[PDB]
Write a protein that binds this ligand. Structure first.
Ligand SMILES: [Cl-]
Ligand SMILES: [Cu+2]
Ligand SMILES: [Cu+2]
Lengths: 136, 146
């Protein structure tokens, strides 16, 4: 048991430190490649889900990105100020706030995808559940 | 292969999205554990090289981590104040700063080692996850340095 236990801890450290390094490299990569569009990574995530489902209520975006309304509201206005999306609230029923891509916001999807796709040269959900438990 | 390339483009934005999101959870786990030992990421880097080669001069640590001596100076002082290392400034000849793990600093290696080891809960799925993060380490570095 002792020899196998020591080796499992070594493999745990090895894998988790690799991912630890990747967290730093990803942050630099996205900052460098998204600069040309004037958007942050979280803004890019908003555009990411809008390009899959458009339009979307802010509550729908928060459910996709696991982000609160207090987090989305500032940057949703930043994407509207930069011309990516439009904001208009319903006057009945759920009273929700609808986010809709502009014409320019929709066209630029391929250019954004191309700038990011190089992250790879030409399972995760189980770790996300376990890691979240360890942190909280 | 127009349509074929736009599909690989989409998967790429999706596999990297999920790999980043899980790497941030590993990072938050590290930050939580390192805080329990009272150390930072940068201090952890110094301890990691000392646990490989001990003692080391200040300059040798700088070569291992590619950090300047000015950057390392407050870190080593903090590691000495918190009981991890000893600092010995030679008073003649090369006048190096020799960094040596304390008895506690040596004993803490296995405690940190074990604490981090809980970051994971299959051998096959390990090799695939390891393989993806190994190639991201290599690819992202090459792209960042352009
Ligand atoms: Cl054994
Ligand atoms: Cu044994
Ligand atoms: Cu084609």
């Amino acid at each position: 048991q002792s020899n196998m236990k020591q080796e499992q801890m070594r493999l745990a450290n090895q894998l988790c430190f690799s991912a630890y390094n990747v967290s730093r490299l990803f942050a630099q990569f996205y900052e460098k490649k998204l600069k040309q569009f004037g958007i942050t990574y979280s803004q890019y995530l908003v555009l990411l889900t809008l390009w899959e489902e458009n339009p979307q209520t802010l509550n729908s975006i928060g459910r996709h990105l696991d982000l609160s309304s207090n987090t989305l509201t500032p940057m949703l206005k930043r994407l509207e100020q930069s011309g990516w999306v439009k904001r208009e609230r319903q006057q009945s029923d759920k009273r929700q706030l609808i986010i809709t891509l502009t014409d320019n916001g929709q066209q630029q999807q391929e250019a954004v995808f191309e700038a990011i796709s190089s992250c790879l040269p030409q399972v995760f959900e189980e770790l996300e559940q376990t890691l979240k438990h360890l942190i909280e």
